[PDB]
Amino acid sequence: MTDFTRGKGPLKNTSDVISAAKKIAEAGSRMDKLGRTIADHCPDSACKQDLLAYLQRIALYCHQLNICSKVKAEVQNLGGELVVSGVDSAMSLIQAAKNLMNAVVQTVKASYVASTKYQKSQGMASLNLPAVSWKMKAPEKKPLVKREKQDETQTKIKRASQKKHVNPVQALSEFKAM
Amino acid sequence: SFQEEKSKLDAEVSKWDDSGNDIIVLAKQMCMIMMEMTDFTRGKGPLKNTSDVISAAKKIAEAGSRMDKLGRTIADHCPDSACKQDLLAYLQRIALYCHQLNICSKVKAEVQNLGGELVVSGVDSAMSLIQAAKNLMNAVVQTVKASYVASTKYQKSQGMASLNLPAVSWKMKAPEKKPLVKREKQDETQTKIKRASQKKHVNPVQALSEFKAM
Amino acid sequence: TTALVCDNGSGLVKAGFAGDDAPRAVFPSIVGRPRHQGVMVGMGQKDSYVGDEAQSKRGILTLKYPIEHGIITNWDDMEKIWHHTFYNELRVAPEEHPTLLTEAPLNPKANREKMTQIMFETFNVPAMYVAIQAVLSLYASGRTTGIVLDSGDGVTHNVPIYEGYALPHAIMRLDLAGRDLTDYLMKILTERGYSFVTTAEREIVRDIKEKLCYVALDFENEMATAASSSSLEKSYELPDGQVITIGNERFRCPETLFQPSFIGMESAGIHETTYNSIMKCDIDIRKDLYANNVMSGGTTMYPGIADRMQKEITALAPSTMKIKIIAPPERKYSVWIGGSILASLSTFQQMWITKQEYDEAGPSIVHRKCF
Amino acid sequence: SLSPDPWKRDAREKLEKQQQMHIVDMLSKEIHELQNKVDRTAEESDRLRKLMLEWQFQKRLQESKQKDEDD
Ligand SMILES: Nc1ncnc2c1ncn2[C@@H]1O[C@H](COP(=O)(O)OP(=O)(O)O)[C@@H](O)[C@H]1O
Ligand SMILES: [Mg+2]
């Protein structure tokens, strides 16, 4: 659905996006169930509190996708596609989708930390903890110096550096099976 | 699973054997008679001439008297509130329309018998009876809805027992969802005089169909 | 079971069940009483008409609005409307349905305290909650960061929100909405010889505005093209068959939103009201607030209002940045849709105002919880 | 699943509408079957009477509803 804006993906029109909205939202409910089981067995600590913070956000984003997609569906039938002929109505659902994914990435890392930290702890038995089925990659080494280029000479106004936002593909690619 | 849901028919079809003991069934019969009289205007119903309209008017007037009696006896036991006043108002309206129907029907019958059929040969004579009938039907629909609301509001009070209250034997379906966005058309270039949209009136067939039985 | 969601505004009343996608009852918020002598026996018993039935009998009634400028002024008529929507519109018993109410920001405290008292004492609901209209518009937009411009029938206000956090010190409320545009149109129409003075005739003028008025991209240039030719003329047919004609008044009426000095108000236009609200926020979040500019309410339904706002903002903001305007097709029901999302939410089921808490705290419980 | 969703309610409404649109066909078939039997029984008159009344009211409602889709 992110690639739908550029029009180079499997989706072709607005109705495809609406169908994709239900699928990602329905998968959100199962993610909430999986995460909450670990939190209940984890003893109260900083990791458990962080884990439950994101599970609050998953419920809000998932519920928004269900109701908002239904509204976009009814508007399509009444006024025709020419009402939604512009792609502007599409980014309403796309914005909530990437908002949900940011919380999903965060709760995966929080769930992993609690599993590894309290792997031996009582109550974690008979559970599919990520600590027994996945491993973390060591983070990449930082550059010792930012190499200068010749493009800064052309620009007469020095601006602040753009903040680097993590890509969910790269955030999940660091997981490796045992 | 198709076989066991035939109880919906049996529950629904069993409401028609009361013989004028329930509000909703009497109102439905009223509605059928009024629909027949209305369709007489186009000459596409059981009524073929004026005398049929006179007989239908007498029948619907008698039904109106029975409905007024039932409304009064259901309104007496309700404690004074905002719902009771509406019920009394529509009961008075029903009484007035029933009396008008009776007297006008008798006068039309006398005129037809005296001056012959050619005096009432034009259909313009029967419009008065049709107008009175539809006014009575609107009043009856309003009083049925008001009676249901009053009965469901005060069904736990004393004296409400031994009454076939419509809130006990009938249930009201929830209203349908409004359209989110107004339908767009090409009327802007088809006509060049914008006009206020005519307000849709409640068809008495629909407002009564939304009652469901258990 | 199902929780009612009632959004009562100055002009219209919206109600329905939480979790749905559209309201189940939309009727005008007027109460009319007869003003003529009754001569036919039995036809004068009814003394008050509420909602749609009052609108069909304008000819023999005096219409009044219980709510003006987002403030309830007639508490006797307001209870009449709330009873109409619970029994004659939704056909539900309030005793087993918690309800959600809405109210504009920067509103007197006594408004919501007395609203809560009626719900618990008169209709006997199990729980309730009062929310902010501008906040609920963000729920329906699928966003958590943006500035909401809500303009209804009585009040226009701006609320900036960043990452789910509100900035109360940057909220601007302006008492100028559709009802003030209707009054200006009646005065303006007298130049052509048309007079509408009756309250029933104000409903006619309101319908004229909704079908013929629009916002001009450039007011000064449009006025030049109005006088030279007659290509902007359109005709409207009155209920009695009379035909009226509108010239430059089509775009003069909605222009007072950007030039409030037409009505005599000293305040600034809605274009630079939003800019002032943005500039009162922190410098770091102004980038995400210039984009994600959400419009809501029926007053923002004029053709070309979104394009006009973008042009005016771009002339004020720095040229390096980008300004976006979000105008959903269903923005007339955005407030209600957000209310349905919030009421049916799983995580929200713990912050209702139960009747037990009202017993030990009274109406003042709403300030500490509802906010 | 986490929260009530409008799609399930929409499916319920569609199923209810289809059930209501098939029960009338069942009623019409029952009327046709009891009408065409030459033999008559005492415990059949009341049933058949209520059946024509219900069918006639349903047909009137359908005819009134159909016109609302036009102008
Ligand atoms: N299509 C339209 N064009 C212009 N003005 C409109 C339009 N629709 C509604 N309005 C005006 O905006 C108001 C919309 O009211 P609404 O936003 O539904 O609730 P509230 O009463 O809370 O404002 C109405 O009073 C009406 O005068
Ligand atoms: Mg509003």
Output the CA B108–ligand 1 centroid distance in Å: 51
- Give which of D38, D60, A59 is closest to C349, Cα–Cα: A59
Does the C-beta of C153 come closer than 6 Å to ligand 1? Answer: yes
CA of C72 to the centre of ligand 2 (A): 14
Top-level class of domain C1-30+67-130+333-367: alpha beta
CB of D9 closer than 8 Å to CB of C20: yes
CB-based contacts of A15, cutoff 8 Å, min separation 6: A76
The number of C-alpha atoms within 13 Å of B178 and in the hemisphere containing its C-beta is 21
The answer to whether B11 touches B17, Cβ cutoff 8 Å, is no
Which residues are CB-neighbours of A128 under 8 A, at least 6 positions away? none
How many helices (H) does chain C have, and how many strands (E)? Answer: 14, 19
In degrees and rounded to multiples of 5, residue C290 shows phi and psi of -65, -45
Distance CA A5, CA A3 (A): 5
CA distance A107 to A57: 10
Q: Which atom of ligand 1 is nearest to the CA of C181?
A: 27
Is there an atom of ligand 1 within 6 Å of C210 CB?
yes
Contacts with A60 from chain C: Cβ below 8 Å: 345, 347
Give me the residue label for tokens 């005016």: C312
User: Could you tell me which chain B residue has the CA closest to the CA of D65?
Assistant: B206
Residue C336 near residue C297, CB atoms below 8 Å: no
Which atom in ligand 1 lies closest to the alpha carbon of residue C333?
Answer: 18
Say yes or no: CB of residue C11 within 6 Å of ligand 1.
yes
> Residue by residue, what is the 3-state secondary structure of B34-103?
HHHHHHHCCCCCCCCCHHHHHHHHHHHHHHHHHHHHHHHHHHCCCCCCHHHHHHHHHHHHHHHHHHHHHH
> Phi and psi (nearest 5°) for C129?
-170, 140
Strand partners, C160: C147
Report whether B182 contacts B158 (CB < 8 A).
Answer: no
Q: What would the DSSP string read from start to end of B184-207?
A: P-SHHHH-SEEEPPPPPPPPHHHH
Cβ atoms of C161 and C285 closer than 8 Å: no
Is the C-beta atom of C299 inside 6 A of ligand 1? yes
3-class secondary-structure state, position C20: coil
Compute CA A112 distance to the chain's CA centroid, rounded to the nearest angstrom: 16
For C62-75, give the secondary structure using H, E and C.
EEECCEECCEECCH
Answer whether B183 sits within 8 Å of A71, measured CB to CB. no
The experimental technique used to determine this model is cryo-EM
On whether the CB atoms of residues A114 and A42 are closer than 8 A, the answer is yes
**Ligand 1 pocket test, candidate residues C12, C102, C148, C181, most atoms within 8 A of CB:** C12
Reported for B37-43, long-range contacts at CB under 8 A and 24+ positions apart, including other chains, are: B37/B129, B37/B130, B37/B133, B38/B130, B38/B133, B38/B134, B40/B126, B40/B130, B41/B123, B41/B126, B41/B130
- To probe the interface with B, which of D22, D24, D34, D64 has the most B CB atoms within 10 Å? D64
Neighbour tally for C308: CB within 10 Å: 24
From B182's Cα to the closest Cα of chain A, the distance in A is 7
CB-nearest to D3 from C20, C21, C344 is: C344
Domain ranges of chain C: 1-30+67-130+333-367, 31-64, 132-177+267-328, 178-263
Resolution of the entry in angstroms: 3.1
Q: Which CATH architecture has domain C132-177+267-328?
A: 2-Layer Sandwich (3.30)
CB A4 within 8 A of CB A76: no
Cα C2 to chain center, whole Å?
A: 25
Length of chain A: 178
Half-sphere exposure of A98 (CA within 13 A, CB side): 12
**Calpha distance B141→B209 (Å, rounded):** 11
Chains that touch C (3 or more CB pairs under 8 A): A, B, D
- Does the beta carbon of C302 lie inside 6 Å of ligand 1? yes
Using alpha carbons, list the distances in angstroms from residue B140 to B27, B132, B143, D53: 7, 12, 5, 20
Measured from the CB, is residue C297 less than 6 Å from ligand 1?
yes
Helix axis angle, A46-79 to C334-344, nearest 10°: 140
Q: Does residue A31 belong to the interface with chain C, where contact is any CB pair within 8 Å?
A: no
What the block records as the tokens of C177 is: 């909405």
Cα–Cα distance, B138 to B133 (Å, whole number): 9
Q: In which residue are the tokens 């009054």 written?
A: C183
What is the Å distance from ligand 1's center to C297 Cα? 7
Asked if residues C99 and C6 have their Cβ atoms less than 8 Å apart, the reply is: yes
- CB atoms under 10 Å from CB of C290, counted, come to 21
Q: Are C323 and C290 in contact (CB under 8 A)?
A: yes
The minimum CA-CA distance between C285 and chain B, rounded to whole Å, is 33
Q: Do domains C1-30+67-130+333-367 and C132-177+267-328 have the same CATH topology?
A: yes
List the one residue out of B87, B206, B70 whose CA is nearest residue B143. Answer: B87
Set of chain C residues whose Cβ sits within 8 Å of the Cβ of B181? 329-330
CATH class name, domain C178-263: alpha beta
C68 Cα: distance to centroid of ligand 1 (angstroms): 14
Q: Is C327 in a helix, a strand, or coil?
A: coil
Helices (H) and strands (E) in chain D, counts: 2, 0
DSSP code string of chain A? --TTTTT-SS--SHHHHHHHHHHHHHHHHHHHHHHHHHHHHSPSSHHHHHHHHHHHHHHHHHHHHHHHHHHHHHHHHHH-TTTT-SGGGTHHHHHHHHHHHHHHHHHHHHHHHHHHHTSSSTT-TTS--GGGTEEEPPPPPPPSS----SHHHH-SS--PPPP-PPPHHHHHHTEEE-
> Which chain B residue lies closest to A81 (C-alpha atoms)?
B184
CATH class of C31-64: mainly beta
Location of structure tokens 């030459």: D38
CA–CA gap between residue C252 and residue C213 (Å, rounded): 8
Chains contacting D (3+ CB pairs below 8 angstroms): A, B, C
Chain C: residue whose CA lies nearest to D1: C346
Q: What type of residue sits at position B123?
A: V
Spatial contact of A73 and A90, defined as CB atoms under 8 Å apart: no
State the Cα–Cα distance between residues A74 and A87, nearest whole angstrom.
Answer: 16
Tokens 């009426």, residue located: C253
Which residues lie closer than 8 Å to C125 by C-beta, 6 or more apart? C94, C95, C97, C98, C99, C119, C355
Instruction: Spell out the long-range contacts of C195-204 with Cβ–Cβ below 8 A and sequence spacing 24 or more.
Output: C199/C62, C199/C63, C199/C64, C200/C58, C200/C59, C200/C61, C200/C63, C202/C63, C203/C55, C203/C58, C203/C63, C204/B196, C204/C238, C204/C239
DSSP secondary structure string for all residues of B118-162: TTT-SGGGTHHHHHHHHHHHHHHHHHHHHHHHHHHHSTTSTT-TT
Q: C12 CB less than 6 Å from ligand 1? A: yes
Cβ pairs bridging B and C (under 8 Å): 72
Task: Say which amino acid occupies C106.
Answer: L
Q: In the block, which residue shows the tokens 């007469």?
A: A156
Tokens representing residue B128 in the block: 């008065």
* Residues sharing a CB contact under 8 Å with residue C127, sequence separation 6 or more, in sequence order: C98, C352, C353, C354, C355
Of B67, B55, B186, the C-alpha closest to B137 is B67
A1 in Cβ contact with A17 (< 8 Å): yes
